[PDB]
Design a protein around this nucleic acid. Structure first.
Ligand SMILES: Nc1ncnc2c1ncn2[C@@H]1O[C@H](CSCC[C@H](N)C(=O)O)[C@@H](O)[C@H]1O
Ligand SMILES: Nc1ncnc2c1ncn2[C@@H]1O[C@H](CSCC[C@H](N)C(=O)O)[C@@H](O)[C@H]1O
Ligand SMILES: [Mg+2]
Ligand SMILES: [Mg+2]
Ligand SMILES: [Mg+2]
Lengths: 192, 291, 291, 193
DNA sequence: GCATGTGTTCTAATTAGAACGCATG
DNA sequence: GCATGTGTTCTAATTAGAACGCATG
């Protein structure tokens, strides 16, 4: 997908699953501050939603998937969130002809086991990239991301490995994932 | 419903079989008279592959563990006219008290069928024929059956093998095969009572037997688990040759790889009832070449 | 030696088979085309009898242990046109270091064949035809071979199965069959090389196989006792169906009674080479009805 | 076998194997002491004897067989003496039309075990009779006999207890013994002395 | 020259059996 | 209203495997 002239960048239409990022997304100017629902649709439980629902919910420009934040409050198995995310994604993808750019993304807050990770990457057709938020004096934020966003992947983020990410599994957003979402600014309207 | 195909325009069938087992799909396709252009089976049990290769003399392209089948594999091996499979049910059936659902254990392997099915589907703008079918047990959690139907966007057909065999085998069948909901009928060669499956000088205690599992305890019948067969005035268990006739397989179909009684029952206990699959694949011979 | 019989005078054959094993005699006689009027078998092993009844659908009258057959039974069950038998050789073959010889242990069951043969012989003044045959191992004490021939008043011809099969099997054959000493020739449907007996995707290391006994050690050949078959670049032993074709038995002949690898070789290890027996029984077609 | 008038009783032509009973049968009086070609033939190793050997040895009126008496003299397996006896017995049978009486007898001196004894009776078509040959003060002699001589199957010997008499067998470790069983042959052939 | 064998045997794996399990027509 | 089930597990019988044997062309 090539980049779009600034005067044709229409407002983004997003569908967020299992987690509402309306607050995080409005912060960086993607949704009108007031009374513009048509940009984000949110669903928490998906086991009963059919393609005809997603098709009728209006075409989407971004489909966001996220796991529950680290905490012993998940009735669903960790693999359930991806399988359902992959289930709806093909419901939301437009016709083979591309009228506009279509994006998707799936983030894990370090809840998937390794075999859940290899199943995740096989279904999303890419190995994930890791986004660390390090300041030396802080070890706070770290998530894994599968997405077709061209700029989230290429930038050579700070390379640190998983036994320190499992020091965060001994520990068993504003700065880190807002930096994740910025490259979407170059494709849709900035509301300021 | 897909448009009918004139006889001349028909080409051989190219099918992708996931969790192939002992090549029951290829068997009923060949016994139906359908020309099999290519049969790509993804199976991991060695003895299973031994049965498929030996009993069909290498017409089956085995392409190991299904989780290692890439997207590129599907287009290279493709196109596929039929996509069949039944995932392991040891973590779905109610016979196992320690089942793990379809999201952990071996139940996740269902989503592999869901994944590779979408790969094999003809892209929009290509309305060539394409059929698929998926089998699993009835004794699964209603949440599991619900989710399976969700991912496949289809509701299952239950067909019990008792109508066409001498055994209880109630299984769900998702798919888009022509006329799966039609009433199933018995054929002349369908061995409907256990006596028809037994060998010479062997007597059947019952007309029908309980659901055959991998283990020897499912050969014992009823509350007290009596032996199902009498021979020479002595009670005996079923024979491997007889279990094969019960399932509709050819006699000595599993006489491969020096397999004993337990091994041959393990492969057969997880397989399909041949007449049930023949009933399902029967309308396919109107869409492909037959010789 | 034997007066010829015109075709219309021929009547079906009546055979007394002692130590019948897996009914090799009946199988050879019916594959030849000879009408078997009666086949009385004396066998003690249950699995052996199971093969005989099931594979031949109850045409064989089993009369168990040979030592309980009286002179009255031979005259009731008779008359017999052919008396065949191979006495067990666990106490006669040189493969057993603790052999007990002809007169002790199991070897003394030879005399039961000699005893019942005299009962079956036509009395003096009965010019009707009568044939007999006795088989045992070559690796036998010269005193035992001498004594066997003494009691049978006949000297044995040795026929090795390798001339007509893919395996070493040298056995002595006492009898009065027409032309036993004639040169052994192979048939166009004789599987003369081990590769001809193997299944699909199985490669033979050797062209011929060492003498097959009951136990698993006779499958691995030669000094180092290497496996005889390669499959998918892995060394493997022979299969039951392959042992059957080595012997000339029909495929799946011993797929009976839930028998495993060891049990089927145990029955096959004691059996006869079918093409050898076919070479011996072939001239009988000119003395009995054939349809 | 009806009995023969005295004036047509020929002398026996007997074949005795494994044991020479020339002394016993001459004493009772079946055999001339003068010797033309001997009427009794004796062989002890018959492993190389064929039918025409027995056939050329002239027709035989009685065939006798015997195990060796208790001792280390048993060079061969115990069953060997019976199987070889049964083999040569068929060689001595005449044509179906019996011109004269043909008798046979096989004696065991408590040598064969019970597995051998039931094999013995199956081949000889007859359960054995035991000869007590035991006086009130001396229980010395004891043998087992299979024979088609009528009086050896007809008459009432005195019974014995076999568990105690297998103990006699390894407590060991002739006239009443079997020569009394030879007497009934006298009515069928000639008396010399 | 030296590999061969219609088996007995002892032991190391290996499998056969039964308990176990409970929601559901 | 009890009987049923594309199985896991641990035990008790199983069997598989290789050593043993040596007169003989
Ligand atoms: N990861 C995997 N990849 C491919 N096949 C697998 C697999 N895991 C298990 N299997 C196989 O899938 C089969 C499911 S049982 C179904 C067998 C088949 N329907 C038949 O008719 O026989 C089993 O034989 C099992 O060996
Ligand atoms: N006492 C007896 N009475 C009858 N058969 C016996 C017996 N003892 C052993 N046998 C049988 O005699 C057979 C000798 S092995 C010979 C088998 C046969 N010739 C064949 O072609 O297969 C064995 O199967 C054994 O079970
Ligand atoms: Mg085969
Ligand atoms: Mg229906
Ligand atoms: Mg059969």
């Amino acid at each position: 997908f090539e980049t779009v002239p600034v005067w044709r960048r229409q407002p983004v239409r997003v569908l967020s699953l299992f987690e509402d990022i309306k607050k995080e997304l409005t912060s960086l100017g993607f949704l009108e501050s007031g009374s513009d629902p048509g940009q984000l649709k949110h669903v928490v439980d998906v086991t009963d939603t059919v393609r005809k629902d997603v098709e009728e919910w209006g075409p989407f420009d971004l489909v966001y998937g996220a796991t529950p934040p680290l905490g012993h409050t998940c009735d669903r198995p960790p693999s359930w969130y991806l399988f359902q995310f992959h289930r709806l994604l093909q419901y939301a993808r437009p016709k083979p002809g591309s009228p506009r750019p279509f994006f998707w993304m799936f983030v894990d807050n370090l809840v998937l086991n390794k075999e859940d990770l290899d199943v995740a990457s096989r279904f999303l057709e890419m190995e994930p990239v890791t986004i660390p938020d390090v300041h030396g004096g802080s070890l706070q934020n770290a998530v894994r991301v599968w997405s077709n966003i061209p700029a989230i992947r290429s930038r050579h983020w700070a390379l640190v490995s998983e036994e320190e990410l499992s020091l965060l599994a001994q520990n068993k957003p504003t700065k880190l994932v807002k930096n994740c979402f910025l490259p979407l600014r170059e494709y849709f309207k900035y509301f300021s | 419903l897909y448009p009918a195909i004139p006889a001349a325009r028909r080409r051989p069938i190219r099918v992708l079989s996931l969790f192939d087992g002992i090549a029951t799909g290829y068997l009923v396709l060949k016994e139906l008279g359908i020309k099999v252009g290519k049969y790509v089976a993804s199976e991991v049990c060695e003895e299973s592959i031994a049965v498929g290769t030996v009993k069909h003399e290498g017409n089956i392209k085995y392409v190991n563990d299904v989780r290692n089948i890439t997207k590129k594999n599907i287009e290279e091996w493709g196109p596929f006219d039929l996509v069949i499979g039944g995932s392991p049910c040891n973590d779905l059936s109610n016979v196992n008290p320690a089942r793990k659902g379809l999201y952990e254990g071996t139940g996740r392997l269902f989503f592999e069928f869901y994944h590779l099915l979408n790969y094999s589907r003809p892209k929009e703008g290509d309305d060539r024929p394409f059929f698929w079918m998926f089998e699993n047990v009835v004794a699964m959690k209603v949440g599991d059956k619900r989710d399976i139907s969700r991912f496949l966007e289809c509701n299952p057909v239950m067909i019990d093998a008792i109508k066409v065999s001498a055994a209880h085998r109630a299984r769900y069948f998702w798919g888009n095969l022509p006329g799966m909901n039609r009433p199933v009928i018995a054929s002349k060669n369908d061995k409907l009572e256990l006596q028809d499956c037994l060998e010479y000088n062997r007597i059947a205690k019952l007309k029908k037997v309980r659901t055959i599992t991998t283990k020897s305890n499912s050969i014992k019948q009823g509350k007290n688990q009596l032996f199902p067969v009498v021979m020479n005035g002595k009670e005996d268990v079923l024979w491997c040759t007889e279990l094969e006739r019960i399932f509709g397989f050819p006699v000595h179909y599993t006489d491969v790889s020096n397999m004993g009684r337990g091994a041959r029952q393990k492969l057969l206990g997880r397989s399909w009832s041949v007449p049930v699959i023949r009933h399902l694949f029967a309308p396919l011979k109107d869409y492909f070449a037959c010789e």
